[PDB]
């Protein structure tokens, strides 16, 4: 069982510039009979099957841009993406096909790089019909920001919260290269009906000082 290790794990480079990804196999995949390496490179977009880019190590599949190219021989390989378009945001894998079992690398995420952008922050109190079912969900939306890292602190009656919130980040937008975050505070009707001030506090590189959005229970 040949092992494919990819380096690095994560990557982000600016538009039109150059991203490069490595792949190392534990045994040579160079077949002497034809002298064409048994290695492939794949692009996988979110929610899509992998798409083959490069077969026999350095041959572009038909319909694939001139900007992707594969290099190397035997054990050490490289995928080079010059002029990183908007459409080129995805995960890339290397795969050998010299000897079954066919084996893959763990993948390398290729992010697009852009100028800092600040989140636009919105707060929604729980809907009336959810309060009917015995629960309150307080949502906080951070819309279109960059970079991905962002600190969201829930404050209830200006008392901090820990443990009772989750979040999820949209994948890097493929048009403006930003991200978005949803943060949900989950409380029982009983525990929600106690406090007055529900505040969502946002810390981000594109904000000079923290931003708060709050509502008073009711209003």
């Amino acid at each position: 069982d040949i092992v494919m290790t990819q380096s690095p794990d994560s990557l982000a480079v600016s538009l039109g510039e150059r991203a490069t990804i490595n792949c190392k196999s534990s045994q040579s995949v160079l077949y002497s009979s034809n002298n064409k390496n048994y290695l492939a490179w794949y692009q996988q977009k979110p929610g899509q099957p992998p798409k083959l880019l490069i077969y026999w190590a350095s041959t572009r599949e038909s319909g694939v841009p001139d900007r992707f190219s594969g290099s190397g021989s035997g054990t050490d390989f490289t995928l080079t993406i010059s002029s990183l378009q908007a459409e080129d945001v995805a995960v890339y894998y290397c795969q050998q096909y010299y000897s079954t079992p066919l084996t893959f690398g763990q993948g390398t995420k290729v992010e697009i790089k852009r100028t800092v952008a600040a989140p636009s922050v919105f707060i929604f109190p729980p809907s009336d019909e959810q309060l009917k079912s015995g629960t309150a969900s307080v949502v906080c939306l951070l819309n279109n920001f960059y970079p991905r890292e962002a600190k969201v602190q829930w404050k209830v009656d200006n008392a901090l919260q820990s443990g009772n919130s989750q979040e999820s980040v949209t994948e890097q937008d493929s048009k403006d290269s930003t991200y978005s975050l949803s943060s949900t505070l989950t409380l029982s009707k009983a525990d929600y009906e106690k406090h007055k001030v529900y505040a969502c506090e946002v810390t981000h590189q594109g904000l000079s000082s923290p931003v708060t959005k709050s509502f008073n229970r009711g209003e």
């Binding site: 069982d1 048994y38 492939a40 794949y42 899509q48 099957p49 992998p50 798409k51 083959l52 077969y55 599949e61 894998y93 795969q95 096909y97 079954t100 079992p101 066919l102 084996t103 893959f104 690398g105 763990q106 993948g107 636009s120 919105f122 929604f124 109190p125 729980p126 809907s127 019909e129 959810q130 079912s133 969900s137 949502v139 939306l141 819309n143 989750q166 979040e167 999820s168 980040v169 949209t170 994948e171 978005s180 949803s182 949900t184 989950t186």
Partner: protein, 209 residues
């Protein structure tokens, strides 16, 4: 290759994945299965050669059996004694040659190995100058996935549909949000179209200010 068959199944249970290979002939090609666990890398499963020989990955040998009979273009993987580690999107990979294992794909089918019963979502509204935001909270569903559209696919600008968060109760939850002009709130209608197919649930919600 339209992968079909996948859904919710118990441990020790069994399923067969079908594969309508309409585009090129099944018998004219070498065919395969490759799985991808949610959030993870790719994992080769099995191979059936155009000749007829078969090989398997360590973790699926005996438990899995690949099958093919040239009917109306179809490939099959038979999965028995299913464990939770087998939870994944399963893909049909067409070869382009004998040893030629350049893989070509379709769309994939989701297999969840869980003893739990299907639960459909409840859909609550996220209520809405320059830009106002609004949305839908799609709470307490199992298993994945849910799709959310806005105005039956007419509204796509400003729409963010977040990846599902697994809650402490073990049921999934997600939100879908849209940014719209403030001035067009009490005149234009906003409905999110929530679809949770595993439980045949379809919900449409007016989002009022």
């Amino acid at each position: 290759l339209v992968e079909t068959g996948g859904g919710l199944i118990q441990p020790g249970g069994s399923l067969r994945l079908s594969c309508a290979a309409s585009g090129f002939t099944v018998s004219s090609n070498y065919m395969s299965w490759v799985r991808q666990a949610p959030g993870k890398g790719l994992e080769w499963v099995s191979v059936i050669y155009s000749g007829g020989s078969t090989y398997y990955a360590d973790s699926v040998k005996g438990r899995f059996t690949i099958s093919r009979d040239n009917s109306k273009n179809t490939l099959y993987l038979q999965m028995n004694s299913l464990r939770a580690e087998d939870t994944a999107v399963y893909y049909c990979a067409r070869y382009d040659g004998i040893y030629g294992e350049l893989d070509f794909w379709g769309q994939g089918t989701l297999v969840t190995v869980s003893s739990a019963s299907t639960k459909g979502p409840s859909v609550f509204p996220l209520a809405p100058g320059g830009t106002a935001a609004l949305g839908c909270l799609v709470k307490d569903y199992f298993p994945e996935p849910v799709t959310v559209s806005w105005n039956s696919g007419a509204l796509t600008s400003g729409v963010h549909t977040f990846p599902a968060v697994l809650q402490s109760s073990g049921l999934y939850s997600l939100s879908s949000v849209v940014t719209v002009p403030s001035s067009s709130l009490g005149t234009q209608t906003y409905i999110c179209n929530v679809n949770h197919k595993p439980s045949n649930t379809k919900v449409d919600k007016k989002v009022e200010p």
